[PDB]
Design a protein around this ligand. Structure first.
Ligand SMILES: N[C@@H](Cn1ccc(=O)n(Cc2ccccc2C(=O)O)c1=O)C(=O)O
Ligand SMILES: [Cl-]
Length: 251
């Protein structure tokens, strides 16, 4: 059985290789998730075929309980595994299984260096520095559903200034931090990726929430626990660290 692996284009997890050489099948791709998949294949001993998810979505549910994205590929048994920066969540666990996480991350703050600002409190108790998040993304949702006193104030701040505090996308948000007295709330993985490449930017404070990326499988898949095992081995031997450094390290 050659396993079908659903995944999604997302830098630096999954990208097309910058090459016109005759590369076919799995060889067309590179990135952290491709390296992880290669290690998993070698530990477990499986053949695999990487397939980009056709609708280009991670996976969410409609009012009819119908799913899309990589999650739907697994549910429909059109993929054996999903190896991507796919968040392990309560709603997804109802319909698919996940290995234990290969990466743990959380919302944090991206801002300029050399400022007194040190945490989320330093932003909430002031208005001279604008702060927001990518509109309609996981990060904004967190602040909109959070009952944590301090994050309720931040959302009340971001929302009252929806037009200029909530950006269109990461690229826009990053440029906004670079070109104005602005702080962007974004996942720690992305902040790390951007700060490695912009010496003028830095992360502020610690993790605001916590979640992990896991390998998705259909419910009952006999590969799930084996993949967890392999992940732990990689973690313990320092391979996940070197895999992360390989892709994240900048100049
Ligand atoms: N992990 C998410 C998808 N995903 C993946 C990488 C990632 O950086 N983000 C964060 C993100 C991407 C684009 C725009 C906004 C945001 C955000 O942090 O809100 C994700 O939401 C999921 O599983 O649905
Ligand atoms: Cl588990």
């Amino acid at each position: 059985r050659t396993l079908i692996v659903t995944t999604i284009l997302e830098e630096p997890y999954v990208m097309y290789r910058k090459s016109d050489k005759p590369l076919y099948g799995n060889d067309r791709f590179e990135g952290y998730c491709l390296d992880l998949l290669k290690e998993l294949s070698n530990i477990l001993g499986f053949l695999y075929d990487v397939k980009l998810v056709p609708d280009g979505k991670y996976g969410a549910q409609n009012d009819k309980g119908e799913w899309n994205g990589m999650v739907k590929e697994l549910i429909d048994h059109r993929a054996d595994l999903a190896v991507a920066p796919l968040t392990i969540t309560y709603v997804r666990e109802k319909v698919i299984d996940f290995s234990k996480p290969f990466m743990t991350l959380g919302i944090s703050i991206l801002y300029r260096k050399g400022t007194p600002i040190d945490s989320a409190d330093d932003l909430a108790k002031q208005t001279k520095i604008e702060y927001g998040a990518v509109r309609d993304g996981s990060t904004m949702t967190f602040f909109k559903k959070s009952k944590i006193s301090t994050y309720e104030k931040m959302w009340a701040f971001m929302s009252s200034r929806q037009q200029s505090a909530l950006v269109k996308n990461s690229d826009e948000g990053i440029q906004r931090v670079l070109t104005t007295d602005y702080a962007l709330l974004m996942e720690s993985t992305s902040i790390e990726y951007v700060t490695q490449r912009n010496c003028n930017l830095t992360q502020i404070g610690g993790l605001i929430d916590s979640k992990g990326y896991g390998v998705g499988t259909p419910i009952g898949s006999p590969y799930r626990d084996k993949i967890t095992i392999a992940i732990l081995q990689l973690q313990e031997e320092g391979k996940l660290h070197m895999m992360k450094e390989k892709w994240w390290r900048g100049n």
